[PDB]
Design an enzyme around this catalytic site. Sequence first.
Site, PDB file in Angstrom:
ATOM      1  N   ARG A 204       0.826  -1.222   0.000  1.00  0.00           N
ATOM      2  CA  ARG A 204       0.000   0.000   0.000  1.00  0.00           C
ATOM      3  C   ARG A 204       0.870   1.287   0.000  1.00  0.00           C
ATOM      4  O   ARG A 204       0.523   2.310  -0.662  1.00  0.00           O
ATOM      5  CB  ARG A 204      -0.944  -0.032   1.215  1.00  0.00           C
ATOM      6  CG  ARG A 204      -1.899   1.154   1.356  1.00  0.00           C
ATOM      7  CD  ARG A 204      -2.991   0.864   2.358  1.00  0.00           C
ATOM      8  NE  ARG A 204      -3.700   2.074   2.852  1.00  0.00           N
ATOM      9  CZ  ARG A 204      -4.955   2.413   2.562  1.00  0.00           C
ATOM     10  NH1 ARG A 204      -5.707   1.662   1.735  1.00  0.00           N
ATOM     11  NH2 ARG A 204      -5.483   3.528   3.089  1.00  0.00           N
TER      12      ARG A 204
ATOM     13  N   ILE B 295      -7.317   7.781  -1.037  1.00  0.00           N
ATOM     14  CA  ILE B 295      -7.279   6.346  -1.025  1.00  0.00           C
ATOM     15  C   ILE B 295      -8.292   5.959   0.092  1.00  0.00           C
ATOM     16  O   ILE B 295      -8.354   6.655   1.139  1.00  0.00           O
ATOM     17  CB  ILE B 295      -5.838   5.862  -0.779  1.00  0.00           C
ATOM     18  CG1 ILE B 295      -5.740   4.337  -0.861  1.00  0.00           C
ATOM     19  CG2 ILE B 295      -5.252   6.408   0.555  1.00  0.00           C
ATOM     20  CD1 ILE B 295      -4.319   3.817  -0.688  1.00  0.00           C
ATOM     21  N   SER B 296      -9.123   4.920  -0.120  1.00  0.00           N
ATOM     22  CA  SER B 296     -10.078   4.507   0.912  1.00  0.00           C
ATOM     23  C   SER B 296      -9.407   3.909   2.133  1.00  0.00           C
ATOM     24  O   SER B 296      -8.238   3.499   2.049  1.00  0.00           O
ATOM     25  CB  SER B 296     -11.058   3.481   0.324  1.00  0.00           C
ATOM     26  OG  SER B 296     -11.885   4.115  -0.639  1.00  0.00           O
ATOM     27  N   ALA B 297     -10.140   3.774   3.243  1.00  0.00           N
ATOM     28  CA  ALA B 297      -9.611   3.044   4.403  1.00  0.00           C
ATOM     29  C   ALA B 297      -9.390   1.575   3.981  1.00  0.00           C
ATOM     30  O   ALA B 297     -10.132   1.047   3.147  1.00  0.00           O
ATOM     31  CB  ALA B 297     -10.581   3.077   5.535  1.00  0.00           C
ATOM     32  N   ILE B 298      -8.372   0.928   4.541  1.00  0.00           N
ATOM     33  CA  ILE B 298      -8.126  -0.450   4.221  1.00  0.00           C
ATOM     34  C   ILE B 298      -9.325  -1.325   4.489  1.00  0.00           C
ATOM     35  O   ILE B 298      -9.610  -2.205   3.668  1.00  0.00           O
ATOM     36  CB  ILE B 298      -7.004  -1.037   5.054  1.00  0.00           C
ATOM     37  CG1 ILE B 298      -5.759  -0.173   4.925  1.00  0.00           C
ATOM     38  CG2 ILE B 298      -6.663  -2.426   4.564  1.00  0.00           C
ATOM     39  CD1 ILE B 298      -4.594  -0.671   5.842  1.00  0.00           C
TER      40      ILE B 298
END
Lengths: 213, 214
Positions: free
Chosen positions: A33, A59-62
């Site tokens: 990431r 970027i979205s949360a994992i």
Amino acid sequence: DLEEQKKAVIEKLIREGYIKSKRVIDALLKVPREEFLPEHLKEYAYVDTPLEIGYGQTISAIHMVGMMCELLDLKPGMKVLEIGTGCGYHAAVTAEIVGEDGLVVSIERIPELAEKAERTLRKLGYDNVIVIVGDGTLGYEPLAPYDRIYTTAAGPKIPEPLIRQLKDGGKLLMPVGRYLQRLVLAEKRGDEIIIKDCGPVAFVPLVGKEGFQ
Amino acid sequence: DLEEQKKAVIEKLIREGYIKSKRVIDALLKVPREEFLPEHLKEYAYVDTPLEIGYGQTISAIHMVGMMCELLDLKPGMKVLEIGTGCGYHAAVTAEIVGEDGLVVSIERIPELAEKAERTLRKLGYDNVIVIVGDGTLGYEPLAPYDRIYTTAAGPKIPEPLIRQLKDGGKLLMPVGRYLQRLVLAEKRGDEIIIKDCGPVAFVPLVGKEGFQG
């Protein structure tokens, strides 16, 4: 350090039910990431939170990437349309799951974002992802139909092009909401679409001819 | 700044290894790519990426045009067949490499697109480029055998008309496959073609009688 934070967050996602499939788990363990983040944010690579990556995109949360991958019911060899490349991370996780005989097509509205994502994906060897600049609310007809479609940005509606471009039996996962937003999963069967509500979410606006002004 | 971006991206491509030939590098530095792009995209003329432009066309990243120019092994004076004019940018790059005594014949299926490409080329002085409206999977018999042939759209096979219209010793470069596509370089020798895999790609489909059916 990164590798420990990474492991910690992945076991968390499993324990809490965010992810459960082997391919999703392994995809999330493999994709680095940090490689997709600007230098100054790399140290936060495995903090489970969204990050701004430029031009007001995130970027979205994992946990969101992981959950989206599960809800999308992906299989090796599938052809997948992603609307909203961003930094390219979610596209890379999709590419791991579908594997080398699969294909990920990814549309990005912001040229500078698409160019950087393309370089990261090249650098890391992702030769089954094609990123194209364009208005993603129209999908991408030249490579349609798709087994699976998702957006990483929220539209005021499900764009008609995305449904039309879905194979029979195909599934579309996207946040929808002019105001407050829900994650919807739609499945094509014949002349019907089955839509399931998958919970409240909040993503950045999907801008285009069949989305937000 | 556009000029800065131009120099910067060509230098990026040299270092990434996509381009290396002086004639290819000079051609990319010369052609004013912005002239070929709709107004709202002109500012993005030197951003390296596939880009949707209109009319169901996706133009290749600059890196793909460079790499194709290199693989094709062009020389001054060559007659070249291009299938899929698009906005006419790749044809101009080809025209620079083969130079004023070369020829580029370019086939476009869509008449409106063909006409705009012709006018941009003519406005800029690319007068050894012929844009013809038609089914490019049939090549272009009237202008003979070609030294080099390439397409900017993927077909199911190398069309036999393109192989027939290639000079002995000639090379053809085109993407082959529908969704999972390979870029292939074919050299003709006698009653043979030698075909080399040049890696995965994903062009829009080549549609026509010897390509993808409607």
